[PDB]
C-alpha cells in the first residue's frame, strides 16, 4: 500500500538551499510573502522582541518559498492587504494588556508607532 520513504536528516540550517527563487508572471505569491515579511518585521520592531512569534512568522515567509511561485488567489491578495491593519490591532491589544492604556489610546499609539517604524525600515533598505 506504501512506498519506501527515506528522510535524509541533516544537522543545521539547510532550509535556504531548498528555496525556489523564480518569480511568477502576474500577481506573484512570493512577492506577497516578501511584503508580509516586511510588515511582520515592522510589528516585531514595535513590540521590541517581547513577541518572538512575529519574528518567527517573518522567518516562515522566507521558508514558504520552498513551494514554487504561482499567481496569488483573491483571498491571498486580500489577506496581504488586511495584514497591516491586523498587526496594528495586535500591537494595540498588547499595549492594553501590558500597559494601562484605554483601547483608543492604545490604537493611536499602535498606528503611529507602526507608521514610524515602517518609514525607518524603508529608509534603511540597502543599495
Amino acid at each position: 500500500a506504501r512506498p519506501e520513504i527515506i528522510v535524509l536528516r541533516e544537522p543545521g540550517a539547510t532550509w535556504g538551499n531548498y528555496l525556489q527563487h523564480q518569480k511568477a508572471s502576474n500577481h506573484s505569491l512570493h512577492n506577497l510573502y516578501n511584503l508580509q515579511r516586511d510588515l511582520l518585521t515592522v510589528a516585531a520592531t514595535v513590540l521590541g522582541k517581547q513577541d518572538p512569534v512575529l519574528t518567527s512568522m517573518a522567518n516562515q515567509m522566507e521558508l514558504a518559498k520552498v513551494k514554487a511561485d504561482r499567481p496569488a488567489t483573491k483571498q491571498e491578495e486580500a489577506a496581504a492587504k488586511a495584514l497591516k491593519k491586523n498587526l496594528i490591532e495586535l500591537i494595540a491589544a498588547r499595549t492594553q494588556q501590558q500597559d494601562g492604556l484605554p483601547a483608543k489610546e492604545a490604537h493611536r499609539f499602535a498606528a503611529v508607532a507602526f507608521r514610524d517604524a515602517q518609514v525607518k525600515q524603508l529608509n534603511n533598505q540597502p543599495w
Binding site: 520513504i5 528522510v7 536528516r9 505569491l29 511582520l40 512569534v53 521558508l63 495586535l90
Partner: protein, 179 residues
C-alpha cells in the same frame, strides 16, 4: 524538485514545537523551546524520487488568529494536534482547528494527531484529571472524531519517547501524495 508543505496546527501547550524538534533532531528539547519551530526543510526519498519536505509550526493562541493563516497557502497536508491528556485540546479540534483549516484550505487533507501519549500511563496526570472529572482520550474515541471530521486518519505519538513519531510523518507524506 517536487515539494511537500506540511503545517502543524493545534492548541497551545499540546506539544506542537517539541514534536517537530524531536522528529527532526531525534532529541527532545528542554533548554531551547521556541514558541514556533525554527525554519526547516529536508530531502525525502519517496520511491526513489527526491522530494523537498518543509515543516511549518504555528502559534495556536487566539492573539494570532488573524496572522496564523499567512502560512497556509500551498499547504499539502495539515497535522491537527491535541494532547491525549487534554480533553480541552481535543474539543478545540472540532470547534476551532478543523473549521479553520477547511475554511482556508478546503480540499487540503489533514491528519488528526494525538500527542504526549506517555502521559496516559502517568498517575499524577490521571490524578489531576480525575479532579474536575476528566479521563485521557482513547484511540477509540479519537478515531471516531477523525471519521466524523473526515481526517485521512488518526495517528498517535510521544515526542518525549519518539514512539509513533516516524509513522506520523510517514502518514502525512503519504496523505500529501494524493488525489
Amino acid at each position: 524538485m517536487q515539494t511537500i508543505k506540511c503545517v502543524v496546527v493545534g492548541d497551545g501547550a499540546v506539544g506542537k514545537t517539541c514534536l517537530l524538534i524531536s522528529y527532526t533532531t531525534n532529541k527532545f528539547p528542554s533548554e531551547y523551546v521556541p514558541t514556533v519551530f525554527d525554519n526547516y526543510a529536508v530531502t525525502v526519498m519517496i520511491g526513489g524520487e527526491p522530494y523537498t519536505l518543509g515543516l511549518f509550526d504555528t502559534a495556536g493562541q487566539e492573539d494570532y488568529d488573524r496572522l496564523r493563516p499567512l502560512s497556509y497557502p500551498q499547504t499539502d497536508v495539515f497535522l491537527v494536534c491535541f494532547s491525549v491528556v487534554s480533553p480541552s485540546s481535543f474539543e478545540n479540534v472540532k470547534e476551532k482547528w478543523v473549521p479553520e483549516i477547511t475554511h482556508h484550505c478546503p480540499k487540503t487533507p489533514f491528519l488528526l494527531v494525538g500527542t504526549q501519549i506517555d502521559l496516559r500511563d502517568d498517575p499524577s496526570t490521571i490524578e489531576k484529571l480525575a479532579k474536575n472529572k476528566q479521563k485521557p482520550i482513547t484511540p477509540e474515541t479519537a478515531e471516531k472524531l477523525a471519521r466524523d471530521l473526515k481526517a485521512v486518519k488518526y495517528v498517535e505519538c510521544s515526542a518525549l519517547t519518539q514512539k509513533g513519531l516516524k509513522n506520523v510523518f510517514d502518514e502525512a507524506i503519504l496523505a500529501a501524495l494524493e488525489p
